[PDB]
Design a protein around this ligand. Structure first.
Ligand SMILES: Nc1ncnc2c1ncn2[C@@H]1O[C@H](COP(=O)(O)OP(=O)(O)OP(=O)(O)O)[C@@H](O)[C@H]1O
Ligand SMILES: Nc1ncnc2c1ncn2[C@@H]1O[C@H](COP(=O)(O)OP(=O)(O)OP(=O)(O)O)[C@@H](O)[C@H]1O
Ligand SMILES: [Mg+2]
Ligand SMILES: [Mg+2]
Lengths: 505, 58, 79
């Protein structure tokens, strides 16, 4: 009976009330204070559920199906929880009316069916030629981010960045996002961001008298040191005579000139490593006419290997012409007071990098977050091909469409369907609420102007406050993220109904 | 009232005389950037407090 | 010594300055809390914070430009 079922529903209603004010734009941020007293203002759905201790089994089970994703995007997480907890909310009112859950499941399952298929016979075909569209869909992701510093600048980048990487695979475009590096240098201006055609290494060339820009680079990616190593690294030496000393530390220093001659044996003109270059070896490279980089991050040597077609060499006695990385031109370039190596004209044409400049020290990170996400949304639309209008449009229709279905479904199962439709309008009602307008007024002004096909892309513009076309204001979203979120969400909702008892050991 | 005309823009308040006067023409002049970064500082904080809905703690 | 999150957050935005000499630091705190104070009086009339933020923002604008289109040019030879 009532026994355990309340506790589950209650636990869920609780989580809903924790995120409610933060759904869509105009959302009212939450403050999170750590155990050592450190403060975080945010609206990240995920963290707020993860970072919490939920006593109840029920909540964690619901957030487990809601939060997650098995694809390379992280969008739909606030809608997934909320629509789910509203569906749980709306189901209680049927248990009050004395409708068994076996009926509510069959009703909602049948409603969900039609509700799913109404995104299929409505989604719009978006391909690679619609680059004037990805610009919009992109901005639609960045616009509710914290930073308002030149987002058009960044929105344009995300398009160029995904369309460059786009490869025709199995007669359909695919995008392997890993072909994009992100480097950030705080300050200057956000307007100074640009896209680099090639991998970018954040360290300098070890002597400025080497070539500024070197022609037809035969790079040598060297993992092993090019500096002497210690005979006293763990503990002190056992030599007693300095003549014996000498001949040790002498032959080990001729071992680096040996390594340098083994690398130039290959015809290398530039050389990058992740360990040192001895000062007698900088001097050795200066006299030969070679361009050397000392202690660069191996994390970007890896990324520079499969971009220039070279190999990250762990033994200087194994380097071959085969292993030298090729690039049309390598140079060192200055950014304020810092200098990085850039390697344009690399053999892999898909491998590119983004250089962020501007903002404050923590804001620049969030600009990187936003860009990760923005590349995501655009890539995932491309990978799919389908995209619907945001702003509650496709939602309001699945409600209207469900309500027309309701009569025909049967007795009690009509009320299930009619509830499902009501839970879906409640979503847009929360969104309207959080804008500071009346949910009923606007819900009705819209759901009457949505009966004819002429108004398919009508939603509610969260700053105007009256029904308009969101498609023609750039507010579009991935048709499949908002499709797997609903499937996920209903699964969870009805799982909360499935529980007759909880037995704890 | 004595600042209604545009000619009396540099009017402020005499802190010893105690009467509205033109401070430019009395030697009390100040860096124009300080009373500008103050305003940006203050509104950021202001608008940010209003942005907090509720508090969670460890 | 403040443990209230909001106060610690406030003092951080107000006190700190990214330039060598620091002035306006008393002004910064009073005007901030006053902007917060005078906003309370609108909340009391049931007005929602998203309006008050956008209201103030549009005002911050006018307020900023009103210092620019008015300052007098001082140089190395105005000793
Ligand atoms: N300017 C706008 N006017 C109207 N609706 C908007 C606007 N911008 C976005 N929306 C709608 O707001 C809805 C909810 O936004 P949000 O993206 O915050 O929910 P979410 O996708 O579940 O959260 P997250 O993106 O963090 O996972 C979106 O699905 C979108 O259609
Ligand atoms: N005799 C005076 N007549 C008019 N105003 C005066 C006079 N002396 C001081 N002032 C005004 O006093 C104001 C406030 O000074 P104060 O420096 O204490 O504020 P603050 O700059 O916020 O504090 P701090 O400099 O420590 O950060 C100045 O902006 C200045 O114009
Ligand atoms: Mg989203
Ligand atoms: Mg002062």
């Amino acid at each position: 009976g009532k026994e355990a079922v309340r506790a589950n529903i209650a636990a869920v209603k609780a989580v809903e009330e924790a995120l409610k004010s933060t759904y869509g734009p105009r959302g009212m941020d939450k403050m999170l204070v750590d155990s050592l007293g450190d403060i975080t203002i945010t609206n990240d759905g995920a963290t707020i559920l993860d970072k919490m201790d939920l006593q109840h089994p029920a909540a964690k089970l619901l957030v487990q199906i809601a939060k997650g994703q098995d694809e390379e995007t992280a969008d739909g997480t606030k809608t997934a929880v909320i629509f789910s907890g509203e569906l749980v909310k709306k189901a209680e009112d049927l248990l009050y009316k004395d409708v068994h859950p076996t009926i509510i499941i069959s009703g909602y399952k049948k409603a969900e069916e039609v509700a799913l298929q109404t995104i299929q016979e409505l989604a719009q075909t978006v391909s690679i030629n619609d680059t004037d569209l990805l610009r919009k869909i992109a901005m639609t992701s960045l616009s509710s981010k914290a930073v308002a510093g030149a987002r058009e600048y960044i929105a344009d980048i995300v398009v160029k960045a995904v369309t460059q990487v786009a490869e025709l695979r199995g007669d359909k475009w695919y995008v392997d996002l890993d072909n994009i590096q992100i480097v950030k240098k705080a300050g200057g201006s956000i307007n100074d961001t640009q896209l680099v055609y090639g991998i970018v290494v954040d360290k300098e060339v070890v002597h400025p008298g080497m070539p500024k820009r070197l022609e037809n680079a035969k790079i040598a990616l060297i993992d092993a040191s090019l500096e002497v190593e210690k005979p006293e690294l763990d503990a002190e030496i056992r030599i007693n005579d300095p003549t014996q000393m000498q001949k040790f530390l002498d032959e080990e220093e001729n071992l680096i000139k040996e390594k340098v001659d083994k690398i130039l044996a290959t015809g290398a003109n530039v050389i990058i490593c992740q360990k040192g270059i001895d000062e007698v070896a900088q001097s050795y490279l200066a006299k030969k006419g070679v361009l050397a980089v000392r202690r660069a991050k191996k994390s970007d040597l890896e990324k520079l290997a499969r971009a220039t077609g070279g190999r990250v060499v762990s033994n200087i006695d194994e380097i071959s012409e085969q292993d030298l990385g090729y690039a049309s031109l390598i140079e060192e370039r200055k950014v304020g007071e810092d200098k990085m190596v850039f390697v344009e004209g690399a053999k892999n044409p898909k491998s590119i990098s983004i250089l962020i400049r501007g903002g404050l020290e923590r804001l620049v990170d969030e600009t990187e977050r936003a860009l990760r996400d923005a590349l995501g949304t655009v890539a995932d639309v491309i990978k799919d091909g389908r995209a619907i209008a945001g702003g509650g449009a496709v939602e309001i229709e699945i409600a209207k469409k469900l309500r027309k279905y309701a009569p025909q479904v049967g007795g009690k199962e009509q009320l299930a369907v009619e509830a499902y439709a009501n839970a879906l309008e409640s979503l847009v009602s929360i969104l309207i609420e959080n804008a500071g307008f009346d949910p009923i007024d606007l819900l009705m002004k819209l759901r009457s102007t949505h009966e004819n096909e002429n108004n398919k892309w009508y939603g509610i513009d969260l700053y105007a406050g009256q029904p308009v076309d969101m498609w023609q204001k750039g507010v579009i979203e991935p048709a499949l993220v908002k499709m797997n979120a609903i499937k996920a969400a209903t699964e969870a909702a009805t799982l909360v109904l499935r529980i007759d008892d909880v037995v704890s050991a």
